[PDB]
């Protein structure tokens, strides 16, 4: 009855709250942030420990050995360090984010030690694996095969808080999501691989998502959907598509930022602090002076008179005299400013929407078109929908390892019925409900 | 510490739950429905009493005399009967629905008896009066006058349950809302009274409501918005508009039902039960036979090939072989069928959206454009947003009369700060939050 929660804040809160319900468990918390762990310590009964994972690797080995399970809530590049500690000692692990290629190399060492390491847990990845494999196993139970798998997911504000230029509010730093617009998107469609161009042209791949008539959604494909054939075992499927959901207008606003030259990792531009008007004067290539003059330069650069994108930049204060935050690049400076202007206030709900669609060919010959809807809202005096959907699957999988319900050993995701069955059942009690519907087509 | 709740089911549940928190209060319940009061008695500790209000008026007088307050949750035509009982005895009253002209005649008798009767309590009417008068009093505190008052309100499904032809699910019978499409809409706009034609042409008055970009809303005006000048004391205002909110496509689907001849109070049409295909054959004027034949007759009648309206009727089963419910008219038969096909399941959320907009002229000369947003969702293992917004204002006003906080006497709405101030404060704790924002225009 003892666990180490590496990392703190936001994702940790529901993990600590869920584990501390029974009482018979000692929560230890390791963290780099000094102020955050102190604030987290006030809410939940824990043992505060301050440590860097890379620098203080010696004390990690001794601390990890004292526990029954390590819950890593750190960035996914640092999992080889925590896995290196966990394989040496006799101790299990659970991971929120992806299982990287670096962590996949340890699978030989992990199985030899006789321990269980569960990765790919949370919303996405996580619940996407669980809902997919539930349906895929149900199809295999009756001899049926998967012909198509389309799955869209999105974390976004509740409709009442969608009235801004991006129709969005940021939970954490947008450096990743902004850079994903520059990245490509590969997916399979009707036995043909479709590569989509990132950057300026990525707006052309955006489509209207009309599965909820009342909800004004757009969609676009993720970075790589072809990998799910090997993961789920559905290489016979002619269509594999995975995408992200936003409200309509989001990608067009980011397309504005791409035109202006804001989405890049170049450094910032003598004896006076750099304001946003002065930075945009640099990009459009004029002297730092006159606000009505840069308006003419910016609107000219943002296509043939795109007033919507001009107003989006005006609303956020990109043409104003506010100071540019100190940062390593222009993209990092933009990200800090967007976090400042578009964040969730204390009484503002977020939303998690997730929509799957399966084409299932039965042995009879007919095609079942199965759909899954998962929609959750944040609680006012409680956890956000993002925190619950990311936190609870990792927290529940952790409790299942301590109780001794998961008998399997080695490195793995939540793909087996042993893992996904109990989790999907238990998240219903926490207010994460998913419905199902299917129709037959002869 | 004793009250009589006339009427039961849906609206009563949150009223009984709110009043029974402290414990020091005896809940009595009068009702016409025998099965409903028994089911309600299982959940909350009450005294079941079965009675018709009109027929058994003798026992009402004796039962009402035993109580401290009568909470009427009946149809609004029956309030003169309950008011006639309450004025005779020394006892207060609270009312959910409108204060009718018939109830307004008793105001002389009500004041002479030395009692308090609060009407117009709930969502709409109710919270519309409270939010309006809060802003209007705040304007009068700084010498400012109201130039415009626009206020849209709507009870509808949460976006995830909007995928049907009406984008709607009915909480109670739709005979009222369907008949309101046939009724006119009067309102004031820029010092000019605007009368809108009901029926077939009412679709032309429907407008896009874009205050939440993520929410795909339509709006249309209510039956009479000119009366709020006298009620709020804003006769100087050049614009008075009150409307109802739905998801886009709702009024166009009802417009389909108007074209087909379904929205009317004519009676139903020998030795075999009447099906929906046979009823639509009567209306389009063909023999009761062949489903593909009536499809051609119906689509011809529903404008020049309106396939959307044809599919809406097809989806609901209006061209199928299901039996028409027993009813006094075609509209009543349609209403029973729509309740059957489009209702809330146990785990399905509803939504209350409400949006006000004030043009406030200050003594300085400038114009304040103030806006109010109120959005609430139904709880999964709890009350619906409709039940909370309708029930709690009546329940809170009832508690304030028993505690002796409302000192005023006579017949009234919730217009004074004495009533609306404490209620708006207390509904925040129950999960009904409203935000405010304003901008100055020189
Ligand atoms: O960015 S999201 O909308 N969804 C993340 C998923 C997985 C990667 C791309 N789409 C978030 F809000 F959930 F983070
Ligand atoms: O019908 S609604 O959408 N709103 C009622 C208000 C008051 C009368 C017309 N509009 C309801 F769902 F709340 F009942």
């Amino acid at each position: 009855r003892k666990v180490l929660v590496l990392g703190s804040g936001y994702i940790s809160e529901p993990v600590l709250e869920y584990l501390s319900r029974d009482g018979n468990i000692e929560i230890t918390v390791g963290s780099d942030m000094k102020n955050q762990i102190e604030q987290l310590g006030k809410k939940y009964n824990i043992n505060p420990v301050s440590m860097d994972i890379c620098k203080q690797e010696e004390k990690l080995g001794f601390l990890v050995a004292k526990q029954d399970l390590v819950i890593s809530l750190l960035p996914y590049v640092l999992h080889p360090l925590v896995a290196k500690a966990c394989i040496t000692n006799k101790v299990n692990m659970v991971t929120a984010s992806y299982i990287t290629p670096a962590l996949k190399e340890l699978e030989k060492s992990v199985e030899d030690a006789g321990i269980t390491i569960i990765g790919e847990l949370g919303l996405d990845p996580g619940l996407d694996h669980m809902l997919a494999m539930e349906s895929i196993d149900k199809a295999k139970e009756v001899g049926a095969t998967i012909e198509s798998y389309i799955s869209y997911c999105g974390g976004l504000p509740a409709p009442e808080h969608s009235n801004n230029p991006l129709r969005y509010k940021f939970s954490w730093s947008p450096v990743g999501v902004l850079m994903n617009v520059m990245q490509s998107a590969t997916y399979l469609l009707d036995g043909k691989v479709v590569n989509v161009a990132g950057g300026i042209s990525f707006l052309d791949a955006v489509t209207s998502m009309d599965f909820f008539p009342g909800l004004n959604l757009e969609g676009y494909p993720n970075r790589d959907s072809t990998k799910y054939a090997e993961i789920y075992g559905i290489s016979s499927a002619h269509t594999l598509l995975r995408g992200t959901l936003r409200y309509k207008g989001y990608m067009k606003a980011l397309n504005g930022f791409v035109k202006l030259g804001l989405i890049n990792r170049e450094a910032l531009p003598e004896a006076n602090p750099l304001t946003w008007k002065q930075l945009l004067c640099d990009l459009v290539g004029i002297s730092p002076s006159s606000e009505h003059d840069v308006l003419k330069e910016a609107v000219l650069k943002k296509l043939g008179g795109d007033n919507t994108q001009l107003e989006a930049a005006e609303w956020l204060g990109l043409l104003g005299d506010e100071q540019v935050p100190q940062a390593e690049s222009i993209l990092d400076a933009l990200s800090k400013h967007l976090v400042m202007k578009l964040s969730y206030g204390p009484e503002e709900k977020d939303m998690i929407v997730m929509r799957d669609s399966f084409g299932i060919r039965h042995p009879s010959g007919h095609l079942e078109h199965k759909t899954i809807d998962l929609v959750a809202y944040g609680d006012i005096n409680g956890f956000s929908a993002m925190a619950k959907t990311v936190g609870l699957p990792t927290a529940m999988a952790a409790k299942m390892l301590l109780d001794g319900e998961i008998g399997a050993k080695g490195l793995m995701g939540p793909f087996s019925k042993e893992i996904y069955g109990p989790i999907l059942e238990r998240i219903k009690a926490e207010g994460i409900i998913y419905t199902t519907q299917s129709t037959i087509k002869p």
Side-chain angles (χ1 to χ4, degrees), chain A residues 3-23 25 27-33 35-37 39-41 43-54 56 59-65 67-83 85-89 91-103 105-107 109-229 231-269 271-296 298-301 304-325 327 329-408 410-427 429-442:
Chain A
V3 299
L4 169 53
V5 178
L6 300 176
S8 59
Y10 200 65
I11 300 164
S12 60
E13 289 193 56
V15 174
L16 304 202
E17 196 278 329
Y18 179 78
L19 294 164
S20 68
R21 295 184 176 180
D22 295 8
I25 180 162
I27 304 300
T28 314
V29 182
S31 183
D32 184 36
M33 302 295 292
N35 294 21
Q36 193 171 247
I37 196 170
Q39 195 68 40
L40 185 60
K43 298 186 180 179
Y44 308 100
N45 55 338
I46 57 174
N47 297 337
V49 181
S50 297
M51 55 158 288
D52 192 289
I53 298 86
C54 212
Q56 305 167 240
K59 74 176 288 188
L60 180 59
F62 307 131
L63 187 58
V64 168
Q67 310 295 343
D68 307 314
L69 172 59
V70 186
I71 301 162
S72 183
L73 306 175
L74 298 167
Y76 53 74
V77 73
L78 305 175
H79 288 126
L81 282 66
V82 182
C86 290
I87 63 101
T88 308
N89 301 310
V91 68
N92 299 317
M93 192 183 172
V94 291
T95 285
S97 24
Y98 304 97
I99 295 161
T100 54
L103 183 54
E105 291 170 22
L106 281 68
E107 190 171 35
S109 304
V110 174
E111 288 187 53
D112 291 15
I115 53 163
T116 312
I117 302 178
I118 309 167
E120 307 264 330
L121 285 161
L123 174 57
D124 195 333
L127 288 169
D128 69 317
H129 300 319
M130 294 181 200
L131 294 175
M133 291 300 297
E134 191 190 60
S135 297
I136 294 159
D137 286 335
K138 277 181 160 59
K140 288 179 179 174
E141 281 173 50
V142 300
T145 61
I146 307 301
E147 289 197 349
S148 59
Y149 171 60
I150 300 160
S151 166
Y152 282 84
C153 177
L156 32 48
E160 66 260 40
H161 306 299
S162 68
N163 194 22
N164 66 64
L166 301 188
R167 298 90 169 77
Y168 206 82
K169 289 174 175 292
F170 302 96
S171 305
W172 59 80
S173 184
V175 173
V177 299
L178 289 165
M179 198 69 189
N180 291 351
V181 173
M182 310 314 294
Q183 301 303 324
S184 63
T186 311
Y187 63 89
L188 181 59
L189 178 61
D190 309 343
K192 287 150 57 54
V193 176
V194 179
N195 296 303
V196 176
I200 194 67
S201 54
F202 196 74
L203 184 57
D204 294 314
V206 177
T207 55
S208 186
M209 303 285 88
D210 308 315
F211 50 78
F212 300 139
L215 211 59
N216 207 241
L217 297 179
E218 66 180 33
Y220 55 90
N222 292 339
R223 193 171 185 283
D224 187 51
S225 309
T226 54
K227 72 178 195 290
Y228 295 101
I231 297 159
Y232 303 144
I234 56 175
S235 58
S236 64
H238 65 79
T239 303
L240 294 163
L241 175 52
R242 286 269 288 162
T244 299
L245 298 167
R246 291 281 180 281
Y247 290 125
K248 292 196 180 180
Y250 173 81
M251 280 301 320
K252 191 165 182 294
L254 269 50
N255 183 256
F257 305 153
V258 173
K259 287 174 177 161
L260 294 168
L262 297 165
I263 313 308
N264 61 79
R265 298 189 163 285
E266 296 288 305
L268 297 164
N272 209 46
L274 185 65
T275 63
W276 276 106
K277 190 200 77 173
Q278 295 165 23
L279 181 51
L280 265 67
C281 284
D282 199 304
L283 295 166
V284 304
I286 62 180
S287 186
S289 280
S290 196
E291 195 274 339
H292 287 107
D293 194 53
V294 70
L295 185 150
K296 181 163 57 52
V299 73
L300 186 141
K301 197 175 190 192
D306 201 315
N307 294 116
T308 308
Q309 294 177 331
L310 177 63
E311 287 166 357
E314 194 76 65
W315 190 94
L316 296 161
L318 301 177
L319 287 74
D321 303 320
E322 295 182 313
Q323 297 182 48
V324 176
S329 65
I330 300 162
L331 177 54
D332 191 44
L334 178 57
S335 302
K336 286 178 168 75
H337 192 65
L338 292 170
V339 167
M340 194 188 296
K341 291 279 177 287
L342 299 168
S343 275
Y344 289 97
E347 300 188 329
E348 296 193 323
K349 291 192 172 201
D350 75 324
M351 187 167 70
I352 296 299
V353 178
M354 183 166 166
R355 168 79 169 190
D356 286 9
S357 179
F358 301 83
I360 301 159
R361 183 68 63 190
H362 290 266
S364 170
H366 66 267
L367 187 69
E368 188 194 339
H369 179 228
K370 190 174 187 179
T371 56
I372 309 174
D373 296 349
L374 184 154
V375 185
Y377 298 82
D379 304 317
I380 296 293
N381 294 307
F383 300 115
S384 69
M386 182 65 81
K388 293 164 71 171
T389 55
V390 173
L392 296 165
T394 311
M396 285 168 177
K399 184 168 163 63
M400 289 163 66
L401 286 167
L402 295 171
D403 294 8
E405 298 178 40
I406 300 163
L411 184 60
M412 59 187 185
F415 306 115
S416 303
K417 192 178 282 176
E418 186 173 34
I419 304 165
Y420 75 71
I423 293 169
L424 290 170
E425 181 62 29
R426 289 162 194 183
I427 63 177
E430 308 304 323
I432 303 170
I433 303 161
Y434 67 99
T435 58
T436 306
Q437 189 184 331
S438 66
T439 61
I440 297 79
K441 300 176 188 176

